[PDB]
Short mmCIF file of C-alpha atoms and ligand atoms in Angstrom, two decimals:
data_model
loop_
_atom_site.label_atom_id
_atom_site.label_comp_id
_atom_site.label_asym_id
_atom_site.label_seq_id
_atom_site.Cartn_x
_atom_site.Cartn_y
_atom_site.Cartn_z
CA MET A 1 1.27 -3.08 -9.48
CA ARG A 2 4.43 -4.99 -8.64
CA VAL A 3 4.77 -6.68 -5.15
CA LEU A 4 7.81 -8.15 -3.57
CA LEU A 5 6.92 -10.27 -0.60
CA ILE A 6 9.79 -10.99 1.92
CA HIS A 7 9.05 -13.17 5.15
CA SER A 8 11.55 -11.62 7.45
CA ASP A 9 12.92 -12.00 11.12
CA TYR A 10 12.70 -8.12 11.11
CA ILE A 11 12.46 -4.91 8.97
CA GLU A 12 13.86 -1.54 10.06
CA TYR A 13 13.79 1.62 8.29
CA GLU A 14 15.17 5.15 8.74
CA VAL A 15 13.84 8.36 6.83
CA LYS A 16 16.48 10.29 5.10
CA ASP A 17 16.03 13.06 2.51
CA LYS A 18 12.67 13.80 0.78
CA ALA A 19 12.50 12.04 -2.62
CA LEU A 20 9.54 14.06 -3.63
CA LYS A 21 9.61 17.92 -3.49
CA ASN A 22 6.55 17.67 -1.18
CA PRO A 23 6.02 14.24 0.49
CA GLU A 24 3.67 12.82 3.07
CA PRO A 25 4.00 14.81 6.32
CA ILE A 26 4.89 12.93 9.29
CA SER A 27 5.99 13.33 12.93
CA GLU A 28 9.13 12.38 14.68
CA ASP A 29 7.56 9.20 15.76
CA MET A 30 7.37 8.13 12.21
CA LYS A 31 11.07 8.93 11.27
CA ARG A 32 11.93 5.31 12.04
CA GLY A 33 10.23 2.04 12.67
CA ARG A 34 10.82 -1.73 13.29
CA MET A 35 8.55 -4.82 13.12
CA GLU A 36 9.58 -8.50 13.70
CA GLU A 37 8.43 -12.09 12.53
CA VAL A 38 6.89 -9.99 9.76
CA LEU A 39 5.92 -10.35 6.03
CA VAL A 40 7.28 -7.39 4.31
CA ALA A 41 5.56 -6.19 1.31
CA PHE A 42 7.79 -3.89 -0.90
CA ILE A 43 5.25 -2.38 -3.18
CA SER A 44 5.57 -0.42 -6.57
CA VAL A 45 2.43 1.38 -7.88
CA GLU A 46 2.28 1.22 -11.63
CA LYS A 47 0.63 3.48 -14.25
CA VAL A 48 -2.02 0.86 -15.05
CA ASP A 49 -3.11 0.99 -11.45
CA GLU A 50 -4.40 4.57 -12.22
CA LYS A 51 -7.17 2.86 -14.26
CA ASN A 52 -9.02 1.27 -11.36
CA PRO A 53 -7.31 2.31 -7.98
CA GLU A 54 -10.04 0.47 -5.78
CA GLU A 55 -9.85 -2.77 -7.79
CA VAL A 56 -5.99 -3.10 -7.45
CA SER A 57 -6.14 -2.36 -3.71
CA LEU A 58 -8.60 -4.95 -3.06
CA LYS A 59 -6.63 -7.55 -5.10
CA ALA A 60 -3.39 -6.74 -3.44
CA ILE A 61 -5.05 -7.01 0.06
CA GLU A 62 -6.19 -10.48 -1.01
CA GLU A 63 -2.99 -11.63 -2.34
CA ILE A 64 -0.97 -10.27 0.46
CA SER A 65 -3.41 -11.83 2.98
CA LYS A 66 -3.04 -15.30 1.37
CA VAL A 67 0.69 -15.36 1.57
CA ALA A 68 0.58 -14.07 5.15
CA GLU A 69 -1.64 -17.04 5.94
CA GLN A 70 0.59 -19.52 4.01
CA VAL A 71 3.77 -18.46 5.75
CA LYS A 72 1.83 -17.87 9.10
CA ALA A 73 2.78 -14.36 9.67
CA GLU A 74 0.50 -12.22 12.06
CA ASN A 75 2.58 -8.99 11.07
CA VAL A 76 2.72 -7.29 7.54
CA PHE A 77 4.73 -4.35 6.69
CA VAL A 78 3.70 -2.10 3.86
CA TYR A 79 6.80 -0.63 2.32
CA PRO A 80 6.64 2.09 -0.35
CA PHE A 81 9.39 0.89 -2.93
CA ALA A 82 9.36 2.49 -6.37
CA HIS A 83 12.12 0.16 -7.97
CA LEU A 84 10.08 -2.80 -8.85
CA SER A 85 8.58 -1.39 -11.81
CA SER A 86 9.82 1.17 -14.45
CA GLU A 87 6.33 2.27 -15.46
CA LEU A 88 5.33 3.96 -12.08
CA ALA A 89 2.02 5.63 -11.34
CA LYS A 90 1.88 9.13 -10.28
CA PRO A 91 2.61 9.86 -6.57
CA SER A 92 -1.01 11.11 -5.64
CA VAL A 93 -2.51 7.71 -6.87
CA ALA A 94 0.32 5.80 -5.50
CA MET A 95 0.02 7.15 -1.98
CA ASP A 96 -3.61 6.52 -2.04
CA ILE A 97 -3.57 2.84 -3.29
CA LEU A 98 -0.76 2.18 -0.72
CA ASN A 99 -3.11 3.51 2.00
CA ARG A 100 -6.06 1.41 0.98
CA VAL A 101 -3.95 -1.81 1.04
CA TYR A 102 -2.46 -0.89 4.57
CA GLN A 103 -6.15 -0.20 5.72
CA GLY A 104 -7.65 -3.20 4.12
CA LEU A 105 -4.92 -5.32 5.75
CA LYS A 106 -5.83 -4.06 9.22
CA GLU A 107 -9.36 -4.75 8.40
CA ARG A 108 -8.31 -8.57 7.85
CA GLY A 109 -7.06 -8.40 11.46
CA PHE A 110 -3.40 -8.40 10.79
CA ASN A 111 -0.89 -6.43 12.90
CA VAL A 112 0.29 -3.85 10.25
CA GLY A 113 3.10 -1.35 9.86
CA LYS A 114 4.24 0.94 7.24
CA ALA A 115 6.94 3.23 6.03
CA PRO A 116 6.27 6.80 5.13
CA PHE A 117 5.59 7.75 1.47
CA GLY A 118 7.83 10.08 -0.58
CA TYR A 119 11.13 9.64 1.12
CA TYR A 120 14.50 8.09 0.73
CA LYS A 121 14.95 5.55 3.51
CA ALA A 122 17.80 3.49 4.86
CA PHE A 123 16.64 -0.10 5.86
CA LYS A 124 17.66 -3.30 7.27
CA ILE A 125 15.84 -6.63 6.61
CA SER A 126 16.53 -10.20 7.31
CA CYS A 127 14.80 -12.79 5.00
CA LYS A 128 14.21 -16.13 6.59
CA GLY A 129 15.17 -17.90 3.23
CA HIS A 130 12.44 -20.58 3.26
CA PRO A 131 10.98 -21.75 0.01
CA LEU A 132 8.06 -19.33 0.59
CA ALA A 133 9.91 -16.48 2.18
CA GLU A 134 10.50 -14.82 -1.29
CA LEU A 135 7.49 -14.16 -3.49
CA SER A 136 6.11 -11.91 -6.16
CA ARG A 137 2.94 -10.73 -7.55
CA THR A 138 2.11 -8.62 -10.46
CA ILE A 139 -1.59 -7.18 -9.99
CA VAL A 140 -3.25 -5.09 -12.71
CA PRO A 141 -6.77 -3.60 -13.37
CA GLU A 142 -9.17 -5.86 -15.32
CA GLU A 143 -12.18 -3.88 -14.83
CA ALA A 144 -13.53 -0.38 -15.46
CA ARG A 145 -13.71 1.96 -12.70
CA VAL A 146 -17.10 3.33 -11.43
CA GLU A 147 -16.97 6.63 -9.53
CA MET B 1 16.96 -8.82 -17.22
CA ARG B 2 15.64 -6.95 -14.30
CA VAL B 3 18.40 -5.36 -11.99
CA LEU B 4 17.82 -3.93 -8.53
CA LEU B 5 21.00 -2.27 -7.15
CA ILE B 6 21.13 -1.68 -3.46
CA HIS B 7 24.13 0.31 -2.17
CA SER B 8 24.48 -1.31 1.21
CA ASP B 9 26.72 -1.28 4.46
CA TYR B 10 26.84 -5.05 4.15
CA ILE B 11 25.21 -8.15 2.67
CA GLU B 12 24.88 -11.56 4.15
CA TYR B 13 23.43 -14.70 2.88
CA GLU B 14 23.08 -18.40 3.88
CA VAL B 15 22.24 -21.17 1.32
CA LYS B 16 19.15 -23.20 2.49
CA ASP B 17 16.97 -25.73 0.66
CA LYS B 18 17.42 -26.20 -3.09
CA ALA B 19 15.25 -24.47 -5.37
CA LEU B 20 16.25 -26.44 -8.54
CA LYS B 21 16.98 -30.19 -8.91
CA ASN B 22 20.35 -29.40 -10.38
CA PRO B 23 21.75 -26.32 -8.75
CA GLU B 24 25.30 -24.87 -8.98
CA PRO B 25 27.30 -27.44 -6.95
CA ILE B 26 28.90 -25.70 -3.66
CA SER B 27 31.16 -26.39 -0.66
CA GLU B 28 30.58 -25.51 2.90
CA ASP B 29 32.60 -22.28 2.45
CA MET B 30 30.21 -21.18 -0.12
CA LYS B 31 27.15 -22.03 2.00
CA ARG B 32 27.47 -18.55 3.42
CA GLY B 33 29.15 -15.30 2.84
CA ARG B 34 29.22 -11.64 3.67
CA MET B 35 30.50 -8.39 2.03
CA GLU B 36 30.61 -4.82 3.27
CA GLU B 37 30.27 -1.37 1.84
CA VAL B 38 28.80 -3.02 -1.23
CA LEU B 39 26.73 -2.34 -4.26
CA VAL B 40 24.41 -5.51 -4.24
CA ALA B 41 23.03 -6.19 -7.71
CA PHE B 42 19.91 -8.45 -7.37
CA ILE B 43 19.32 -9.85 -10.80
CA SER B 44 16.59 -11.84 -12.39
CA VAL B 45 17.38 -13.09 -15.90
CA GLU B 46 14.43 -13.07 -18.33
CA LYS B 47 13.27 -15.14 -21.21
CA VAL B 48 13.90 -12.53 -23.66
CA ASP B 49 17.63 -12.22 -22.50
CA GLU B 50 17.88 -15.80 -23.97
CA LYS B 51 17.96 -14.23 -27.53
CA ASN B 52 21.30 -12.50 -27.03
CA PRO B 53 23.10 -13.53 -23.72
CA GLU B 54 26.38 -11.89 -24.50
CA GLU B 55 24.54 -8.52 -25.40
CA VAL B 56 22.55 -8.36 -22.14
CA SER B 57 25.56 -9.22 -20.09
CA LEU B 58 27.65 -6.40 -21.47
CA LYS B 59 24.96 -3.84 -21.01
CA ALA B 60 24.46 -4.97 -17.34
CA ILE B 61 28.20 -4.89 -16.80
CA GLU B 62 28.31 -1.38 -18.03
CA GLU B 63 25.07 -0.10 -15.99
CA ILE B 64 26.40 -1.77 -12.73
CA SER B 65 29.98 -0.57 -13.08
CA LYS B 66 28.48 2.87 -13.76
CA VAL B 67 26.32 2.91 -10.71
CA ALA B 68 29.38 1.50 -8.86
CA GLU B 69 31.36 4.53 -9.88
CA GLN B 70 28.57 6.94 -8.93
CA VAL B 71 28.20 5.63 -5.34
CA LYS B 72 31.98 5.00 -5.09
CA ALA B 73 31.43 1.29 -4.34
CA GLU B 74 34.51 -0.79 -4.79
CA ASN B 75 32.73 -3.99 -3.77
CA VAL B 76 30.03 -5.53 -5.90
CA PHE B 77 27.82 -8.65 -5.01
CA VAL B 78 26.09 -10.45 -7.82
CA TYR B 79 22.90 -11.95 -6.11
CA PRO B 80 20.55 -14.34 -8.01
CA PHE B 81 17.03 -13.06 -7.39
CA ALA B 82 14.39 -14.83 -9.67
CA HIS B 83 11.53 -12.70 -8.16
CA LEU B 84 12.37 -9.48 -9.90
CA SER B 85 10.70 -10.72 -12.96
CA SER B 86 7.81 -13.15 -13.77
CA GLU B 87 9.26 -14.02 -17.10
CA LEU B 88 12.48 -15.88 -16.06
CA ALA B 89 15.05 -17.22 -18.41
CA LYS B 90 16.02 -20.91 -18.75
CA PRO B 91 18.45 -21.79 -15.63
CA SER B 92 21.33 -22.76 -17.68
CA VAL B 93 21.26 -19.47 -19.51
CA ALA B 94 20.43 -17.60 -16.30
CA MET B 95 23.58 -19.22 -14.81
CA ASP B 96 25.81 -18.31 -17.85
CA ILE B 97 24.73 -14.84 -17.93
CA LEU B 98 25.19 -14.27 -14.20
CA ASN B 99 28.62 -15.65 -14.50
CA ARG B 100 29.40 -13.25 -17.56
CA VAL B 101 28.21 -10.39 -15.45
CA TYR B 102 30.29 -11.50 -12.42
CA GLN B 103 33.46 -12.09 -14.60
CA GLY B 104 32.81 -8.70 -16.56
CA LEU B 105 32.67 -6.72 -13.23
CA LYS B 106 35.81 -8.59 -12.09
CA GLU B 107 37.58 -7.51 -15.16
CA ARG B 108 36.89 -3.90 -14.42
CA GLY B 109 38.99 -4.16 -11.34
CA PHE B 110 36.18 -4.43 -8.73
CA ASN B 111 36.22 -6.74 -5.68
CA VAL B 112 33.31 -9.10 -6.83
CA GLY B 113 31.30 -11.53 -5.03
CA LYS B 114 28.50 -13.94 -6.31
CA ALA B 115 26.08 -15.77 -4.29
CA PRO B 116 25.40 -19.53 -5.31
CA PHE B 117 22.86 -20.23 -7.98
CA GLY B 118 19.79 -22.52 -7.73
CA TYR B 119 18.94 -22.27 -4.04
CA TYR B 120 16.56 -20.66 -1.46
CA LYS B 121 18.74 -18.39 0.65
CA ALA B 122 18.32 -16.42 3.78
CA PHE B 123 19.88 -12.92 3.82
CA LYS B 124 20.37 -9.78 5.68
CA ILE B 125 21.05 -6.42 4.05
CA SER B 126 21.31 -2.96 5.08
CA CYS B 127 20.76 -0.31 2.49
CA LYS B 128 22.32 3.16 3.08
CA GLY B 129 19.15 5.06 2.08
CA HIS B 130 20.89 7.95 0.08
CA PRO B 131 19.23 9.06 -3.12
CA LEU B 132 21.32 6.63 -5.31
CA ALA B 133 21.29 3.80 -2.86
CA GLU B 134 18.37 2.27 -4.47
CA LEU B 135 18.20 2.03 -8.25
CA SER B 136 16.64 -0.40 -10.70
CA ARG B 137 17.38 -1.25 -14.43
CA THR B 138 15.70 -3.27 -17.06
CA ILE B 139 17.95 -4.57 -19.61
CA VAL B 140 16.95 -6.48 -22.66
CA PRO B 141 18.53 -7.30 -26.08
CA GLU B 142 17.76 -5.06 -29.08
CA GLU B 143 15.27 -7.63 -30.10
N1 LIG C 1 4.77 4.48 -7.91
C1 LIG C 1 5.09 4.49 -6.64
N2 LIG C 1 5.17 3.29 -5.74
C2 LIG C 1 5.68 3.41 -4.65
N3 LIG C 1 6.16 4.20 -4.20
C3 LIG C 1 6.14 5.45 -4.90
C4 LIG C 1 5.62 5.64 -6.09
N4 LIG C 1 5.93 6.70 -6.62
C5 LIG C 1 6.72 7.50 -5.57
N5 LIG C 1 6.66 6.72 -4.49
C6 LIG C 1 7.26 7.16 -3.15
O1 LIG C 1 8.10 8.30 -3.42
C7 LIG C 1 9.51 7.94 -3.09
C8 LIG C 1 10.48 8.45 -4.19
O2 LIG C 1 9.91 8.02 -5.56
C9 LIG C 1 9.60 6.50 -3.10
N6 LIG C 1 10.47 5.96 -2.15
C10 LIG C 1 11.23 4.89 -2.19
O3 LIG C 1 10.95 3.86 -3.35
C11 LIG C 1 12.41 4.44 -1.23
N7 LIG C 1 12.50 2.99 -1.27
C12 LIG C 1 13.56 5.09 -1.71
O4 LIG C 1 14.50 4.99 -0.67
C13 LIG C 1 8.18 6.08 -2.37
O5 LIG C 1 8.14 6.46 -0.99
N1 LIG C 2 16.08 -16.61 -14.28
C1 LIG C 2 16.65 -16.60 -13.06
N2 LIG C 2 17.24 -15.37 -12.57
C2 LIG C 2 17.92 -15.36 -11.28
N3 LIG C 2 18.03 -16.59 -10.75
C3 LIG C 2 17.54 -17.61 -11.01
C4 LIG C 2 16.81 -17.81 -12.41
N4 LIG C 2 16.43 -19.05 -12.53
C5 LIG C 2 16.85 -19.75 -11.51
N5 LIG C 2 17.44 -19.05 -10.50
C6 LIG C 2 18.13 -19.51 -9.35
O1 LIG C 2 17.38 -20.59 -8.86
C7 LIG C 2 16.73 -20.30 -7.67
C8 LIG C 2 15.30 -20.42 -7.60
O2 LIG C 2 14.73 -20.01 -8.75
C9 LIG C 2 16.90 -18.85 -7.53
N6 LIG C 2 16.89 -18.22 -6.11
C10 LIG C 2 16.46 -17.20 -5.65
O3 LIG C 2 15.88 -16.06 -6.60
C11 LIG C 2 16.61 -16.84 -4.21
N7 LIG C 2 16.66 -15.32 -3.89
C12 LIG C 2 15.48 -17.40 -3.33
O4 LIG C 2 15.64 -17.22 -2.08
C13 LIG C 2 18.25 -18.45 -8.27
O5 LIG C 2 19.34 -18.77 -7.35
#
């Protein structure tokens, strides 16, 4: 999994065309969204992640939480972004992992937002530009799955 | 080299603290800048690129210019973005390579901008959201 962390003043998105023949169904309310004073987590689910989906999600929740604490962000935005990697995991698995992370983050008590999976989206972001406002993490499975 | 191309309505940046002890010297005018209707090329130069700087540069110039043609973008902005890779090249080489890519695009007749190298920078961007508005490319030399 590849993760690009951007501490921003805001993040806005607007769903455009479907990128997958059949993407995650959503309502009018989800077409667009906006968060402020937020740590934006652009995430690319890689093939390897298919090995131990649960392991990776936990790892990412941990890594993402740590940066949030460091930069002191109470808001985190999970953003499906399939361009941080060129070895992508299949959609079904990707959407699942992305959901766990999101869920795991709310479990940590952060205010969390997200963009819908499987669409091309327009977006506007404003990175603060501090030493810690731009970070990356590569998280891969290191254990066998048990299911 | 890891390249992330974002066709945008605009791009804005403002140089903040230094990220290197010896960053690209700049003036006040360069401290900040803005381009509109532009293909932004976020680039992280990798250690492997060090093997053949010229080669990587050429391929990047052809890939970028190609996507520039596809989205009909006349403006291109070269934006140093280390965090696209975890195996970054030596600064001196990254700098030279970025300049090669800058000049190479400039040569093709595009209006090219280039953000300063070696600093932490705040920025604002607006991605159009079209099918080809977000693309990535990995470009390494032929070993
Ligand atoms: N491995 C993966 N990691 C993260 N996201 C993935 C994915 N595979 C599919 N997607 C989702 O499908 C859209 C088109 O690939 C993806 N959309 C995007 O990456 C938008 N930024 C395009 O504008 C995303 O919603
Ligand atoms: N291999 C490399 N590829 C691209 N850029 C590189 C580099 N090595 C050094 N830099 C420059 O130094 C700043 C801190 O690493 C980098 N700054 C940045 O990546 C900003 N986006 C931080 O806000 C960049 O200017």
